[PDB]
Structure 1
Amino acid sequence: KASGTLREYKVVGRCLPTPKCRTPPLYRMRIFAPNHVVAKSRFWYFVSQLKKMKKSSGEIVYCGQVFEKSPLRVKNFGIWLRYDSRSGTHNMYREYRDLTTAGAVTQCYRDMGARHRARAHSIQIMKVEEIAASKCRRPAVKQFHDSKIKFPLPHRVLRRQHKPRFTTKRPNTFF
């Protein structure tokens, strides 16, 4: 499993109809994946973990991308994690602050790869829940809960160093 910018796919599936059971139950998951092919692959992975169902012994009924119901509203997201270390598998709970669920899960994959070297094949997303201003347990998220937030951009180091590279003025950083 690799990553790009992630997308959220509602994938439902069931088993093939048999003479012993003509109407199998339908199972739904919310797979975070770059595209729908690997979304269906991770769906078969988690359903093969949970229930007795393989890809040849079943079918995906519908795989479709679900979109953010309010993309313009900033939200807190609590994501439950089951990852694998160099030692045995560990469980975590992370909180992020982003517009979309798939964006928060993307930030979660980059943050797990940055902090703990948890790769996308070792990370199993349990579930993501949107959170109000309360019910938050992380100070890096709770420091942005302010009615009148106020901070400068103190050491605003400049970029565009190489368009004209040789200059007379030493560059400024107080802006």
Structure 2
Amino acid sequence: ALKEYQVVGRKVPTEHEPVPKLFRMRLFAPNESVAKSRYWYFLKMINKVKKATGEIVAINEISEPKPLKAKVFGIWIRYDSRSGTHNMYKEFRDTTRVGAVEAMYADMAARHRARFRSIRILKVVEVEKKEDVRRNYVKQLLNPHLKFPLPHRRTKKVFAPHRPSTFY
């Protein structure tokens, strides 16, 4: 299960700079070991700050403030592929920001055969406004007349005596 970790890190003080800058990042990882490692990847990737010259000063797991209210989340990712340069924006409807990312990691792997290492989520933001939704399926999920038939569940107890009802 993924967890949203808030990681704050900075370079160690030296004679050149008395006080260093503080960098905070939000990223998703199963355990704090992965989050700290991914956080160091981004700073090197971005600020070109060495891990050996820096340290992690704060780590904190973040829980969903409103996990009982359905929301729509917009997610931006960067893709490393055969071309090695791509960027896409996707929308998901759920109750937990972490749940969107787990669902997000599912479709990239399903469609684009992508991996956890390649994807670097730039930003996740809740899209409260219905008009801001750019995806048709979410818009269909936002109508006041949501009522649809059941998707088939294809459910030892071998050798049933009677034909199953397989209906409502």
Do both share a fold (TM > 0.5)? yes
Q: Please say if 1:111 is aligned against 2:107.
A: yes
1:88 to partner: Cα distance: 2.9
1:140 corresponds to which letter in structure 2? Y
1:69-99, Cα deviation, whole Å (9 max, x unpaired):
1111111000001112223321100000011
Which residue number corresponds to residue 89 of structure 1? 85
1:11 to 7, 21, 41: 7
TM-score, scaled relative to structure 2 = 0.94
1:158 to partner: Cα distance: 4.4
Give structure 2 stretches of 5+ with no counterpart: none
| Aligned mates of 1:68, 1:20 — CA distance in 2 | 41
| Aligned mates of 2:48, 2:118 — CA distance in 1 | 22
| Aligned mates of 2:144, 2:13 — CA distance in 1 | 57
Q: Please say if 1:149 is aligned against 2:142.
A: no
1:32·1:39 contact (CA, 8 Å) conserved in 2? yes
| Aligned mates of 2:43, 2:74 — CA distance in 1 | 23
SS of the equivalent of 2:39 reads helix
Q: Which runs of 4+ in 1 moved over 4 A?
A: none
Q: CA RMSD in A?
A: 1.3
For this pair of structures, how many residues does the alignment match?
A: 167
1:148 to partner: Cα distance: 2.9
Which residue number corresponds to residue 159 of structure 2? 166
Which residue number corresponds to residue 46 of structure 1? 42
TM-score, scaled relative to structure 1 = 0.90
Matched-pair identity in %: 54
1:156·1:173 contact (CA, 8 Å) conserved in 2? no
Equivalences for residues 4-83 of structure 1 within 5 A = 5-83=1-79
1:156·1:174 contact (CA, 8 Å) conserved in 2? no
| Aligned mates of 2:133, 2:84 — CA distance in 1 | 28
2:41 corresponds to which letter in structure 1? Y
Shift in alpha-carbon separation, 1:20–1:95, aligned structure 2, 3 A: same
Which residue number corresponds to residue 135 of structure 2? 138
